[PDB]
Tab-separated table of C-alpha atoms and ligand atoms in Angstrom:
chain	number	residue	atom	x	y	z
A	5	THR	CA	-19.135	7.455	3.483
A	6	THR	CA	-20.138	11.016	2.649
A	7	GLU	CA	-22.082	11.388	-0.594
A	8	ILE	CA	-20.504	14.194	-2.613
A	9	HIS	CA	-22.614	16.448	-4.796
A	10	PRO	CA	-21.491	16.248	-8.445
A	11	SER	CA	-21.523	20.063	-8.671
A	12	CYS	CA	-18.716	20.166	-6.082
A	13	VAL	CA	-16.394	17.945	-8.191
A	14	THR	CA	-14.352	18.838	-11.268
A	15	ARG	CA	-12.157	16.362	-13.167
A	16	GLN	CA	-9.136	18.009	-14.748
A	17	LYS	CA	-6.479	15.458	-15.745
A	18	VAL	CA	-6.365	11.693	-16.320
A	19	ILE	CA	-3.734	9.930	-14.181
A	20	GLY	CA	-4.325	6.350	-15.283
A	21	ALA	CA	-6.834	3.918	-16.675
A	22	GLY	CA	-7.480	0.213	-17.007
A	23	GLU	CA	-10.352	-2.192	-17.306
A	24	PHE	CA	-11.363	-1.202	-13.755
A	25	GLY	CA	-12.128	2.351	-14.846
A	26	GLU	CA	-9.974	5.467	-14.585
A	27	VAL	CA	-8.241	7.779	-12.124
A	28	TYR	CA	-8.288	11.563	-12.490
A	29	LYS	CA	-6.752	14.567	-10.832
A	30	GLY	CA	-9.367	17.163	-9.990
A	31	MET	CA	-10.749	19.688	-7.518
A	32	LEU	CA	-13.323	19.426	-4.747
A	33	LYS	CA	-15.440	22.211	-3.223
A	34	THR	CA	-15.986	21.527	0.483
A	35	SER	CA	-17.037	25.120	1.352
A	36	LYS	CA	-11.282	27.157	-1.292
A	37	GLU	CA	-11.291	24.055	-3.411
A	38	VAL	CA	-8.834	21.249	-2.660
A	39	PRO	CA	-7.075	18.906	-5.113
A	40	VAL	CA	-8.328	15.325	-5.107
A	41	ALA	CA	-7.890	12.024	-6.880
A	42	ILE	CA	-11.043	10.688	-8.518
A	43	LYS	CA	-11.384	6.956	-9.139
A	44	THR	CA	-14.235	5.977	-11.445
A	45	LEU	CA	-16.088	2.704	-11.883
A	46	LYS	CA	-15.952	1.658	-15.521
A	47	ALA	CA	-19.182	1.246	-17.468
A	48	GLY	CA	-20.759	-1.095	-17.421
A	49	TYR	CA	-20.609	-3.083	-14.282
A	50	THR	CA	-22.116	-5.847	-12.289
A	51	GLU	CA	-24.028	-5.379	-9.070
A	52	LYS	CA	-21.278	-7.204	-7.188
A	53	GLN	CA	-18.775	-4.841	-8.834
A	54	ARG	CA	-20.783	-1.781	-7.891
A	55	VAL	CA	-21.369	-2.945	-4.327
A	56	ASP	CA	-17.700	-3.957	-4.042
A	57	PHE	CA	-16.587	-0.586	-5.449
A	58	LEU	CA	-18.734	1.230	-2.897
A	59	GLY	CA	-17.920	-1.252	-0.140
A	60	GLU	CA	-14.202	-0.621	-0.541
A	61	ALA	CA	-14.874	3.094	-0.158
A	62	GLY	CA	-16.817	2.262	3.004
A	63	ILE	CA	-13.769	0.452	4.373
A	64	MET	CA	-11.457	3.366	3.581
A	65	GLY	CA	-13.908	5.837	5.128
A	66	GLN	CA	-13.599	4.105	8.508
A	67	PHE	CA	-10.050	5.411	8.940
A	68	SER	CA	-8.825	8.875	9.907
A	69	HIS	CA	-5.048	9.125	10.174
A	70	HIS	CA	-2.259	11.363	8.869
A	71	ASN	CA	-0.529	8.353	7.235
A	72	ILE	CA	-3.641	6.749	5.681
A	73	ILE	CA	-5.046	8.130	2.439
A	74	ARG	CA	-8.186	10.104	3.228
A	75	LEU	CA	-11.562	9.487	1.679
A	76	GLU	CA	-13.327	12.731	0.847
A	77	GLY	CA	-16.500	10.962	-0.271
A	78	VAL	CA	-18.263	9.042	-3.021
A	79	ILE	CA	-20.670	9.698	-5.845
A	80	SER	CA	-22.926	6.650	-5.918
A	81	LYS	CA	-26.262	8.068	-7.111
A	82	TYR	CA	-25.025	9.322	-10.505
A	83	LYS	CA	-22.746	8.035	-13.277
A	84	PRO	CA	-19.928	7.584	-13.501
A	85	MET	CA	-19.625	6.486	-9.921
A	86	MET	CA	-16.668	7.987	-8.127
A	87	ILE	CA	-14.395	7.479	-5.150
A	88	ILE	CA	-12.830	10.824	-4.239
A	89	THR	CA	-9.660	10.807	-2.169
A	90	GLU	CA	-6.944	13.098	-0.941
A	91	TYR	CA	-4.468	13.903	-3.732
A	92	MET	CA	-0.888	12.657	-3.490
A	93	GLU	CA	1.382	14.708	-5.723
A	94	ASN	CA	4.239	12.204	-5.939
A	95	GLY	CA	2.199	9.048	-6.566
A	96	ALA	CA	3.234	5.545	-5.580
A	97	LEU	CA	6.395	5.155	-3.505
A	98	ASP	CA	8.073	2.431	-5.543
A	99	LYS	CA	7.945	4.478	-8.696
A	100	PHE	CA	8.799	7.671	-6.850
A	101	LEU	CA	11.949	6.163	-5.325
A	102	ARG	CA	13.146	4.824	-8.709
A	103	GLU	CA	12.623	8.287	-10.139
A	104	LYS	CA	14.616	9.734	-7.211
A	105	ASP	CA	17.378	7.093	-7.179
A	106	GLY	CA	20.116	8.051	-4.702
A	107	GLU	CA	18.713	11.529	-4.014
A	108	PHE	CA	17.529	11.221	-0.384
A	109	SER	CA	19.475	11.060	2.853
A	110	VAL	CA	19.165	8.013	5.091
A	111	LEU	CA	17.251	10.133	7.612
A	112	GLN	CA	14.732	11.078	4.929
A	113	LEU	CA	14.202	7.437	3.923
A	114	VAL	CA	13.815	6.373	7.546
A	115	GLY	CA	11.277	9.155	8.025
A	116	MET	CA	9.269	7.656	5.162
A	117	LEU	CA	9.336	4.249	6.871
A	118	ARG	CA	8.212	5.832	10.151
A	119	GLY	CA	5.215	7.352	8.393
A	120	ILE	CA	4.262	4.019	6.838
A	121	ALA	CA	4.712	2.313	10.187
A	122	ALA	CA	2.538	4.902	11.940
A	123	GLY	CA	-0.212	4.316	9.390
A	124	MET	CA	0.088	0.554	9.895
A	125	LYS	CA	0.031	0.931	13.683
A	126	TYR	CA	-3.272	2.788	13.362
A	127	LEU	CA	-4.674	0.026	11.154
A	128	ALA	CA	-3.451	-2.660	13.564
A	129	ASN	CA	-5.174	-0.787	16.424
A	130	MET	CA	-8.372	-0.882	14.342
A	131	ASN	CA	-7.991	-4.659	13.877
A	132	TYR	CA	-7.558	-4.119	10.123
A	133	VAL	CA	-5.170	-6.468	8.313
A	134	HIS	CA	-3.948	-4.921	5.065
A	135	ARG	CA	-2.664	-8.078	3.283
A	136	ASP	CA	-1.033	-6.113	0.421
A	137	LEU	CA	1.482	-3.882	2.153
A	138	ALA	CA	4.042	-2.994	-0.525
A	139	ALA	CA	5.699	0.148	-1.801
A	140	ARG	CA	3.314	0.210	-4.776
A	141	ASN	CA	0.455	0.765	-2.244
A	142	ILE	CA	2.196	3.615	-0.413
A	143	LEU	CA	1.369	7.072	-1.740
A	144	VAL	CA	3.631	10.131	-1.371
A	145	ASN	CA	2.523	13.783	-1.237
A	146	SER	CA	4.564	16.917	-1.985
A	147	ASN	CA	5.913	17.145	1.515
A	148	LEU	CA	7.197	13.527	1.137
A	149	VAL	CA	4.577	12.260	3.594
A	150	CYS	CA	3.942	8.545	2.995
A	151	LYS	CA	0.397	7.178	3.322
A	152	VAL	CA	-0.987	3.648	3.294
A	153	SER	CA	-3.565	2.848	0.606
A	154	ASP	CA	-5.102	-0.154	-1.149
A	155	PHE	CA	-6.295	0.757	-4.636
A	156	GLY	CA	-7.107	-2.930	-5.161
A	157	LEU	CA	-4.349	-4.154	-7.481
A	158	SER	CA	-4.860	-7.620	-5.914
A	159	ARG	CA	-8.578	-7.718	-6.650
A	160	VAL	CA	-8.802	-6.994	-10.299
A	161	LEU	CA	-11.042	-9.238	-12.357
A	162	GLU	CA	-9.276	-11.639	-14.563
A	163	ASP	CA	-11.812	-14.382	-14.358
A	164	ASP	CA	-14.136	-15.218	-17.143
A	165	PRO	CA	-17.717	-14.494	-15.979
A	166	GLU	CA	-18.554	-18.121	-16.848
A	167	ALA	CA	-15.466	-19.893	-15.483
A	168	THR	CA	-15.994	-22.958	-13.310
A	169	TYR	CA	-13.141	-21.844	-11.023
A	170	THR	CA	-12.595	-18.278	-9.928
A	171	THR	CA	-10.241	-16.462	-7.692
A	172	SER	CA	-11.891	-15.710	-4.376
A	173	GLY	CA	-10.607	-13.537	-1.679
A	174	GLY	CA	-8.085	-11.979	-4.048
A	175	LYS	CA	-4.677	-12.977	-5.303
A	176	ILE	CA	-1.642	-13.057	-2.981
A	177	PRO	CA	1.537	-10.964	-3.471
A	178	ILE	CA	3.951	-13.851	-2.867
A	179	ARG	CA	7.120	-11.724	-2.621
A	180	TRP	CA	5.514	-9.547	0.097
A	181	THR	CA	3.602	-12.202	2.057
A	182	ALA	CA	4.640	-13.927	5.282
A	183	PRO	CA	5.157	-17.712	5.039
A	184	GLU	CA	2.282	-18.590	7.382
A	185	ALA	CA	-0.040	-16.441	5.274
A	186	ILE	CA	1.104	-18.160	2.069
A	187	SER	CA	0.781	-21.619	3.626
A	188	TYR	CA	-2.314	-21.395	5.842
A	189	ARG	CA	-3.804	-18.024	4.775
A	190	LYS	CA	-3.167	-16.878	8.345
A	191	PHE	CA	-3.314	-13.118	7.746
A	192	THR	CA	-2.667	-10.986	10.847
A	193	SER	CA	-1.012	-7.698	11.727
A	194	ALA	CA	2.031	-9.894	12.317
A	195	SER	CA	1.977	-10.993	8.689
A	196	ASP	CA	1.683	-7.314	7.736
A	197	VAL	CA	4.868	-6.722	9.765
A	198	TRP	CA	6.675	-9.195	7.499
A	199	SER	CA	5.401	-7.227	4.502
A	200	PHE	CA	6.619	-4.038	6.170
A	201	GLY	CA	10.136	-5.462	6.334
A	202	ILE	CA	9.906	-6.061	2.596
A	203	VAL	CA	8.768	-2.431	2.163
A	204	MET	CA	11.797	-1.356	4.215
A	205	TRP	CA	14.013	-3.186	1.720
A	206	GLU	CA	12.191	-1.571	-1.218
A	207	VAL	CA	12.805	1.856	0.318
A	208	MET	CA	16.462	1.272	1.096
A	209	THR	CA	17.123	-0.011	-2.469
A	210	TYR	CA	15.198	2.921	-4.007
A	211	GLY	CA	12.601	0.560	-5.380
A	212	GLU	CA	14.336	-2.649	-6.384
A	213	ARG	CA	11.972	-5.532	-6.994
A	214	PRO	CA	12.253	-8.036	-4.113
A	215	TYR	CA	13.984	-11.276	-5.149
A	216	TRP	CA	13.926	-9.967	-8.714
A	217	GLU	CA	16.136	-12.722	-10.144
A	218	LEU	CA	13.774	-15.407	-8.802
A	219	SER	CA	10.527	-16.927	-10.013
A	220	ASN	CA	7.651	-16.933	-7.547
A	221	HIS	CA	8.412	-20.538	-6.599
A	222	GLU	CA	12.118	-19.750	-6.561
A	223	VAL	CA	11.204	-17.154	-3.918
A	224	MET	CA	9.249	-19.510	-1.661
A	225	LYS	CA	11.970	-22.108	-1.589
A	226	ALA	CA	14.666	-19.551	-0.977
A	227	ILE	CA	12.714	-18.303	2.039
A	228	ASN	CA	11.993	-21.589	3.784
A	229	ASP	CA	15.616	-22.589	3.193
A	230	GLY	CA	16.360	-19.488	5.300
A	231	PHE	CA	17.415	-16.905	2.709
A	232	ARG	CA	16.566	-13.297	3.516
A	233	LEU	CA	16.889	-10.223	1.355
A	234	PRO	CA	20.483	-8.923	1.400
A	235	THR	CA	21.721	-5.767	3.081
A	236	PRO	CA	21.357	-2.866	0.626
A	237	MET	CA	24.341	-0.671	-0.077
A	238	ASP	CA	24.405	2.280	2.335
A	239	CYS	CA	21.668	0.733	4.512
A	240	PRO	CA	22.559	1.339	8.188
A	241	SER	CA	23.039	-1.756	10.317
A	242	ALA	CA	20.225	-0.845	12.707
A	243	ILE	CA	17.773	-0.550	9.795
A	244	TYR	CA	18.795	-3.880	8.287
A	245	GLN	CA	18.541	-5.484	11.726
A	246	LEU	CA	14.997	-4.135	12.027
A	247	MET	CA	14.227	-5.741	8.643
A	248	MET	CA	15.475	-9.120	9.841
A	249	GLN	CA	13.284	-8.933	12.946
A	250	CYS	CA	10.212	-8.309	10.779
A	251	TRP	CA	11.237	-11.440	8.826
A	252	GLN	CA	11.337	-13.806	11.805
A	253	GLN	CA	9.740	-17.120	10.901
A	254	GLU	CA	7.653	-17.264	14.089
A	255	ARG	CA	5.167	-14.389	13.948
A	256	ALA	CA	5.003	-13.993	17.738
A	257	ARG	CA	8.632	-12.858	17.613
A	258	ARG	CA	8.170	-10.064	15.062
A	259	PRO	CA	7.936	-6.516	16.415
A	260	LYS	CA	4.523	-4.945	16.601
A	261	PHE	CA	3.973	-1.826	14.540
A	262	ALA	CA	3.945	0.249	17.737
A	263	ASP	CA	7.476	-1.051	18.406
A	264	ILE	CA	8.556	-0.205	14.850
A	265	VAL	CA	7.357	3.392	15.230
A	266	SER	CA	9.243	3.730	18.532
A	267	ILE	CA	12.449	2.183	17.175
A	268	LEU	CA	12.401	4.431	14.126
A	269	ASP	CA	11.585	7.497	16.252
A	270	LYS	CA	14.613	6.868	18.477
A	271	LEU	CA	16.915	6.387	15.484
A	272	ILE	CA	15.681	9.601	13.840
A	273	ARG	CA	16.252	11.534	17.067
A	274	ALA	CA	19.740	10.131	17.509
A	275	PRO	CA	21.864	9.154	14.450
A	276	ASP	CA	23.932	6.868	14.643
A	277	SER	CA	22.720	4.600	13.149
B	320	GV0	C1	6.461	12.166	-10.281
B	320	GV0	N1	5.314	12.710	-11.029
B	320	GV0	C2	4.709	11.644	-11.846
B	320	GV0	C3	3.429	12.127	-12.575
B	320	GV0	N2	2.442	12.784	-11.685
B	320	GV0	C4	1.423	11.933	-11.004
B	320	GV0	C5	1.923	10.623	-10.398
B	320	GV0	C6	0.710	9.806	-10.058
B	320	GV0	N3	-0.093	10.503	-9.038
B	320	GV0	C7	-1.037	9.797	-8.387
B	320	GV0	O1	-1.191	8.609	-8.679
B	320	GV0	N4	-1.731	10.440	-7.430
B	320	GV0	C8	-2.750	9.881	-6.724
B	320	GV0	C9	-3.540	8.827	-7.199
B	320	GV0	C10	-4.580	8.302	-6.441
B	320	GV0	O2	-5.329	7.248	-6.944
B	320	GV0	C11	-5.975	6.455	-6.023
B	320	GV0	C12	-7.371	6.366	-5.957
B	320	GV0	C13	-8.016	5.549	-5.017
B	320	GV0	C14	-7.245	4.777	-4.134
B	320	GV0	N5	-7.706	3.960	-3.156
B	320	GV0	C15	-8.888	3.302	-3.228
B	320	GV0	O3	-9.655	3.334	-4.196
B	320	GV0	C16	-9.268	2.430	-2.018
B	320	GV0	C17	-8.264	2.393	-0.848
B	320	GV0	O4	-7.150	2.925	-0.949
B	320	GV0	N6	-8.720	1.732	0.253
B	320	GV0	C18	-7.958	1.593	1.365
B	320	GV0	C19	-7.222	2.653	1.908
B	320	GV0	C20	-6.453	2.492	3.059
B	320	GV0	C21	-6.465	1.265	3.699
B	320	GV0	F1	-5.716	1.086	4.832
B	320	GV0	C22	-7.213	0.212	3.185
B	320	GV0	C23	-7.973	0.381	2.028
B	320	GV0	C24	-10.113	1.165	-2.330
B	320	GV0	C25	-10.784	2.358	-1.656
B	320	GV0	C26	-5.856	4.871	-4.215
B	320	GV0	F2	-5.109	4.153	-3.387
B	320	GV0	C27	-5.221	5.680	-5.149
B	320	GV0	C28	-4.839	8.856	-5.192
B	320	GV0	C29	-4.082	9.928	-4.744
B	320	GV0	N7	-3.044	10.421	-5.533
B	320	GV0	C30	0.159	11.921	-8.741
B	320	GV0	C31	0.635	12.747	-9.953
B	320	GV0	C32	3.108	13.792	-10.838
B	320	GV0	C33	4.305	13.207	-10.083
């Protein structure tokens, strides 16, 4: 990661805040200034927290792709510590699609899915398994470009610092996670492809919550009994068929992300479907 000089960074507007810290909109001088998001580490912290905060930035900094959020740099030597990323004017996809209910064409929605799939193909080619692929972790810019991110919603601290038992390795998003990853913690790019099919269903419902009528255990039983998410209204058959292939029980049968990009490219270049 690049260390950013604090003089080059300006915070202008608060986007959100929690016990983790805060997120700001601001400007960065690379030398004209560019808009950025600025994630801060809350005071005070623990040396695992600070190393984990910086270590997550190190992971993000390894990637360079149009459909992966870009790391501009970090401030680690001064307080508050900061992760400084590319700015995404439309925020998280799930919220964006609920705000824009019914307002996009099918070709526009499929273009979003292609962008997500192209980001995931890059990650797969880097041997990176995301494990939390969901519309809430897809960011959207003004041009409607969709980019993969992982703010770390799965890794927030909710464990007492003195608890005998703690969560380790993060919590699991059951509604987005492939069955073999829930059962054996077998996380692979193939289990990310299952999650991608769930993202496809989020997009085509303009942000419905998957299995929303069902408790987390109600979801797991429904799945192993063979239930799959239903065909959204106005979802083309070819898109729903792609979803079902991502949700194949045997992971060796799911498409690879490279295949998903190609399938979506061909559809975009020739509707029908
Ligand atoms: C519709 N309008 C609503 C109000 N308003 C807002 C909406 C909310 N907005 C917003 O949230 N913008 C935004 C926030 C941002 O906050 C983040 C800050 C940091 C992160 N990511 C990270 O911290 C990490 C990460 O993403 N790692 C990572 C990345 C990619 C991978 F493949 C794996 C790990 C952990 C290092 C992140 F995913 C998001 C980033 C960029 N843009 C934009 C303006 C205008 C739009």
